[PDB]
Amino acid sequence: EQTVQVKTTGKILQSPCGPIIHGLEDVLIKSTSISDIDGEKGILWYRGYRIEELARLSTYEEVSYLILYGRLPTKRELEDYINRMKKYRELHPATVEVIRNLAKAHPMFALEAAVAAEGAYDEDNQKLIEALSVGRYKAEEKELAYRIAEKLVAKMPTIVAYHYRFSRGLEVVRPRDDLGHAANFLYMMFGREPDPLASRGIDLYLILHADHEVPASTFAAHVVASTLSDLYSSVAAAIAALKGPLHGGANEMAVRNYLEIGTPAKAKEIVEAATKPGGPKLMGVGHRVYKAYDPRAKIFKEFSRDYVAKFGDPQNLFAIASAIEQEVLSHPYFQQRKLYPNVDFWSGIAFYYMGIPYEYFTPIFAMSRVVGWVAHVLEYWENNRIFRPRACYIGPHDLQYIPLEQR
């Protein structure tokens, strides 16, 4: 037994067993080469590449390859990958039936259940499970794991879209091999090939949210994977965590708030009210890591501007958000505390205008982040260790059982 000095910005709880870092805030679980953030400068990298470059020059197909494999693909590697992903988009009939049965339920339950279901009949997954059951994880198993990772990234939009269609009493729209990842998602949701601007927005969103820190969803994936449980189950657990209101829902709440506000003229007073104790907090402003404008927000804001330039801003969402942004950027309270817009400030606007129901916002985040989840699991598996935390017992000992009739 040894003592370790752990730096945390979180709250510490007192216990007879020693201090407890509440929510293990800032506690390190591993080193990673997946993504990095410079919170002071407001820079995000995926596998060494700045998000600006990837958003500008790449696609979710290429970025997902980068996140999963650790480098940019060659032309042949990307072509083969795209073709594998296209083939993988379709779900097993049992999975589709699971989704159908959960058509009237919240989409996140359908995602959890569908991911587990799809994992149940995946032959590679079964093979990998057999291998890990005897502690074998060598070249062949790693190949299975990467194939499974690809499948999970490929299938997530299909699960989401199918649920959307069934939930609306619409006929399911199956994946089209001739469409890209983002375009095909919109096609599956709405049954028509999407406008290229709309497709670009989805692709950009997927790129921008592919990996970031170790939120509770990514952490859940690690804990499940740490027992050598399968990749599908690890992603299902990630989705279970993601559905909690403390993980996500900010981009939805930001849009609902903009609608409530109704007029950009209120921006100044809203921002002022947010500087006072008990005041309604501004959704998508401030960040635990970024003490600068979130680079993802800068990029998505520009996409949003393009979207409303083409399709209009009928609910004045972009106007309202823009007015609030300008007040946030000029208010000393926010400036002094380095509180800036984050990507959630903007990202729900296009979704809302595209006709994506609010309840599908978080599922779309899962569509993006699934690649980060699987890449994180595979990385942890390079040096796996089952998680074995503890609790401090403060209950009594040796209570005497009293017969039922005497209680």
> Interface residues with Mg ion (CB under 5 A)?
302
In the bound state with a copy of itself, the residue whose beta carbon lies nearer, of 87 and 288, is 288
Q: Pick from 123, 171, 382, 398 the residue near a copy of itself by CB under 8 A.
A: 398
Catalytic position from the list 212, 294, 344, 376: 344
- Using a 10 angstrom Cβ sphere, with 0-12 exposed, 13-18 middle and 19 or more buried, the burial of residue 370 is buried
Q: What is the distance between the alpha carbons of residues 164 and 114, in angstroms, rounded to a whole number?
A: 13
Among 15, 263, 330, 335, binds a copy of itself (CB under 8 A): 15
Tokens of 3: 């003592």
CA separation (Å) from 231 to 33, 225, 281?
Answer: 19, 7, 37
Instruction: Name the residue nearer to a copy of itself (CB basis): 217 or 368.
Output: 217
Please, what is the Cα angle at 130 between 128 and 136, to 5 degrees? 75
Its sign, for the CA torsion 197, 203, 207, 211, is: positive
Q: Which of 209, 212, 287, 376 is catalytic?
A: 287
Least distance (Å) between residue 381 CB and a copy of itself: 11
- Please identify, using beta-carbon distances, which residue of 276 and 388 lies nearer to a copy of itself: 388
Restricted to residues 54-113, the positions that interact with a copy of itself (CB under 8 A) are: 54, 57-58, 62, 72-75, 78, 94, 97-98, 101-102, 104-106, 108-110, 112-113
Annotation says 344 is catalytic: yes
What is the C-alpha to C-alpha distance for residues 98 and 254, in angstroms, rounded to an integer?
32
Active site residue 287: yes
CB of 322 to a copy of itself, least distance (A): 27
Cβ proximity to a copy of itself: between 206 and 224 the closer is 224
DSSP state for residue 315 in the 8-state scheme: T
Annotated binding residue 25? no
Site for a copy of itself in 111-130 (CB under 8 A): 112-114, 116-117, 119-121, 126, 129
Contact in structure between 210 and 218 (CB atoms under 8 Å): no
Please state, in angstroms and rounded to a whole number, the distance separating the CA atoms of residues 284 and 199: 24
Chosen from Mg ion, a copy of itself, none, partner binding at 59 (C-beta under 5 to 8 Å by type) = none
Q: Is 98 exposed, middle or buried (0-12, 13-18, 19+ CB in 10 A)?
A: buried
Six-digit token pair at 71?
């480098």
Regarding 139 and contact with a copy of itself (CB under 8 A), the answer is no
- Write each residue from 18 to 37 as x if it is in contact with a copy of itself (CB under 8 A), else as -, in one continuous string: xxxxxxxxxxxxxxxxxxx-
Q: Is 272 annotated as a binding residue?
A: no
49 binds, options a copy of itself, Mg ion, none, Cβ within 5 to 8 A by partner type: a copy of itself
344: Cβ contacts below 8 Å, ≥ 6 apart: 250, 251, 254, 283, 284, 297
**CB of residue 83 to a copy of itself, shortest distance in Å:** 15
Residues 250-309 that bind a copy of itself (CB under 8 A): 288
User: Which residues are annotated as catalytic?
Assistant: 287, 344
Annotated binding site for Mg(2+): 302, 306
